[PDB]
Every structure is written in structure tokens, then in C-alpha cells.
Motif scaffolding. Structure first.
Motif, PDB file in Angstrom:
ATOM      1  N   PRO A   1       0.848  -1.163  -0.058  1.00  0.00           N
ATOM      2  CA  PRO A   1       0.039  -0.004   0.171  1.00  0.00           C
ATOM      3  C   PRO A   1       0.801   1.065  -0.137  1.00  0.00           C
ATOM      4  O   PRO A   1       1.877   1.326   0.962  1.00  0.00           O
ATOM      5  CB  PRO A   1      -0.961  -0.129   1.365  1.00  0.00           C
ATOM      6  N   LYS A   2       0.436   2.341  -0.663  1.00  0.00           N
ATOM      7  CA  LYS A   2       1.085   3.446  -0.820  1.00  0.00           C
ATOM      8  C   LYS A   2       0.739   4.390   0.214  1.00  0.00           C
ATOM      9  O   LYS A   2       1.816   5.320   0.780  1.00  0.00           O
ATOM     10  CB  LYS A   2       0.913   4.164  -2.079  1.00  0.00           C
ATOM     11  N   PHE A   3      -0.254   4.046   1.256  1.00  0.00           N
ATOM     12  CA  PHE A   3      -0.252   4.697   2.471  1.00  0.00           C
ATOM     13  C   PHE A   3       0.528   4.442   3.590  1.00  0.00           C
ATOM     14  O   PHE A   3       0.947   5.158   4.405  1.00  0.00           O
ATOM     15  CB  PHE A   3      -1.748   4.844   2.688  1.00  0.00           C
ATOM     16  N   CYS A   4       1.401   3.391   3.537  1.00  0.00           N
ATOM     17  CA  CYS A   4       2.554   2.894   4.282  1.00  0.00           C
ATOM     18  C   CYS A   4       3.714   3.879   4.021  1.00  0.00           C
ATOM     19  O   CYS A   4       4.514   3.796   5.009  1.00  0.00           O
ATOM     20  CB  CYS A   4       3.037   1.509   3.992  1.00  0.00           C
ATOM     21  N   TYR A   5       3.823   4.800   2.962  1.00  0.00           N
ATOM     22  CA  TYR A   5       5.015   5.591   2.590  1.00  0.00           C
ATOM     23  C   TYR A   5       4.502   6.946   3.497  1.00  0.00           C
ATOM     24  O   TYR A   5       5.434   7.765   3.590  1.00  0.00           O
ATOM     25  CB  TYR A   5       5.087   5.871   1.223  1.00  0.00           C
ATOM     26  N   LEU A   6       3.185   7.455   3.486  1.00  0.00           N
ATOM     27  CA  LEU A   6       2.994   8.601   4.117  1.00  0.00           C
ATOM     28  C   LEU A   6       3.737   8.880   5.460  1.00  0.00           C
ATOM     29  O   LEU A   6       3.397   7.832   6.439  1.00  0.00           O
ATOM     30  CB  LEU A   6       1.179   8.716   4.261  1.00  0.00           C
ATOM     31  N   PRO A   7       4.227   9.781   5.766  1.00  0.00           N
ATOM     32  CA  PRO A   7       5.251   9.986   6.784  1.00  0.00           C
ATOM     33  C   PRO A   7       4.310  10.037   8.158  1.00  0.00           C
ATOM     34  O   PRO A   7       3.054  10.054   8.009  1.00  0.00           O
ATOM     35  CB  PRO A   7       5.747  11.290   6.767  1.00  0.00           C
ATOM     36  N   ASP A   8       4.876   9.740   9.576  1.00  0.00           N
ATOM     37  CA  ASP A   8       3.769   9.694  10.625  1.00  0.00           C
ATOM     38  C   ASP A   8       3.065  10.986  10.606  1.00  0.00           C
ATOM     39  O   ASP A   8       3.643  12.128  10.799  1.00  0.00           O
ATOM     40  CB  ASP A   8       4.566   9.626  11.910  1.00  0.00           C
ATOM     41  N   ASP A   9       1.706  10.868  10.591  1.00  0.00           N
ATOM     42  CA  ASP A   9       0.774  12.128  10.918  1.00  0.00           C
ATOM     43  C   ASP A   9      -0.174  11.908  12.139  1.00  0.00           C
ATOM     44  O   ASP A   9      -1.165  11.571  11.854  1.00  0.00           O
ATOM     45  CB  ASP A   9       0.109  12.035   9.558  1.00  0.00           C
ATOM     46  N   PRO A  10       0.500  12.118  13.193  1.00  0.00           N
ATOM     47  CA  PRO A  10       0.004  12.209  14.392  1.00  0.00           C
ATOM     48  C   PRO A  10      -1.260  13.512  14.372  1.00  0.00           C
ATOM     49  O   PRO A  10      -1.842  13.554  15.307  1.00  0.00           O
ATOM     50  CB  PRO A  10       0.713  12.756  15.576  1.00  0.00           C
TER      51      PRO A  10
ATOM     52  N   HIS B   1      -2.065  12.732  23.577  1.00  0.00           N
ATOM     53  CA  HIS B   1      -1.102  11.605  23.629  1.00  0.00           C
ATOM     54  C   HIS B   1      -2.056  10.291  23.468  1.00  0.00           C
ATOM     55  O   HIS B   1      -2.248   9.710  24.739  1.00  0.00           O
ATOM     56  CB  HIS B   1      -0.237  11.654  24.954  1.00  0.00           C
ATOM     57  N   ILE B   2      -1.829   9.753  22.482  1.00  0.00           N
ATOM     58  CA  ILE B   2      -2.317   8.368  22.180  1.00  0.00           C
ATOM     59  C   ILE B   2      -1.221   7.501  21.354  1.00  0.00           C
ATOM     60  O   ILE B   2      -0.594   7.737  20.566  1.00  0.00           O
ATOM     61  CB  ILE B   2      -3.639   8.277  21.115  1.00  0.00           C
ATOM     62  N   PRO B   3      -0.550   6.155  21.930  1.00  0.00           N
ATOM     63  CA  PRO B   3       0.339   5.396  21.450  1.00  0.00           C
ATOM     64  C   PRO B   3      -0.123   4.919  20.002  1.00  0.00           C
ATOM     65  O   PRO B   3      -1.188   4.338  20.068  1.00  0.00           O
ATOM     66  CB  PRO B   3       0.491   4.157  22.357  1.00  0.00           C
ATOM     67  N   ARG B   4       0.416   5.424  19.130  1.00  0.00           N
ATOM     68  CA  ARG B   4       0.302   4.889  17.735  1.00  0.00           C
ATOM     69  C   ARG B   4       1.324   4.662  16.855  1.00  0.00           C
ATOM     70  O   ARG B   4       2.554   4.771  17.491  1.00  0.00           O
ATOM     71  CB  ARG B   4      -0.488   6.109  17.017  1.00  0.00           C
TER      72      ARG B   4
ATOM     73  N   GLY C   1      -2.295  12.671  18.309  1.00  0.00           N
ATOM     74  CA  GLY C   1      -3.078  13.662  19.094  1.00  0.00           C
ATOM     75  C   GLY C   1      -4.615  13.631  18.980  1.00  0.00           C
ATOM     76  O   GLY C   1      -5.279  12.908  19.838  1.00  0.00           O
ATOM     77  N   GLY C   2      -5.099  13.809  17.885  1.00  0.00           N
ATOM     78  CA  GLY C   2      -6.776  13.848  17.669  1.00  0.00           C
ATOM     79  C   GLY C   2      -7.090  14.904  16.540  1.00  0.00           C
ATOM     80  O   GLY C   2      -8.471  15.066  16.650  1.00  0.00           O
TER      81      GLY C   2
END
Length: 68
Positions: free
Chosen positions: A4-13, A19-22, A38-39
Motif C-alpha cells: 500500500p502507498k499509504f504505508c509511505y505517508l510520514p507519521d501524521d499524528p 497523547h495516544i500510543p500509535r 493527538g486527535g
């Protein structure tokens, strides 16, 4: 890609102040990492483990007989 290409999207909190463990997959380094969510904003790249993160993008691969 076979993955999947979405696996390349940088971490987008997102841009929130929570604060949520992701988790997200980092293909550029071929490794899973944990981030603080975040949220506010986000993407399809938002797991709760490393074993999931690799099974999402690092699937169907047979090359390297136990690399060092």
C-alpha cells in the motif's frame, strides 16, 4: 508497488495537543516506529504495533537468507 502507498505517508499524528500510543511504517528506512497521536489530523498509517505495521506493507517478501 506490491504494497500500500499509504504505508509511505510520514507519521501524521496531526496538530493536536493530546497523547495516544500509535504506530506507522517508515519504508524509507524499512522499519516500524511508534509515534504519539493527538486527535486532529491523521492518515491510513496509524497502527498499535510493529508486527501489524510490517504485515501491512512488508508483506509477501522472500529475499535474504537471514541477513546479519
Amino acid at each position: 508497488q506490491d504494497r500500500p502507498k499509504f504505508c509511505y505517508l510520514p507519521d501524521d499524528p496531526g496538530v493536536c495537543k493530546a497523547h495516544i500510543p500509535r504506530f506507522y511504517y517508515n519504508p524509507a528506512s524499512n522499519k516500524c516506529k511508534e509515534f504519539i497521536y493527538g486527535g486532529c489530523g491523521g492518515n491510513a498509517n496509524n497502527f498499535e504495533t510493529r508486527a501489524e505495521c510490517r504485515h501491512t506493507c512488508v508483506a509477501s517478501r522472500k529475499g535474504g537468507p537471514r541477513r546479519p
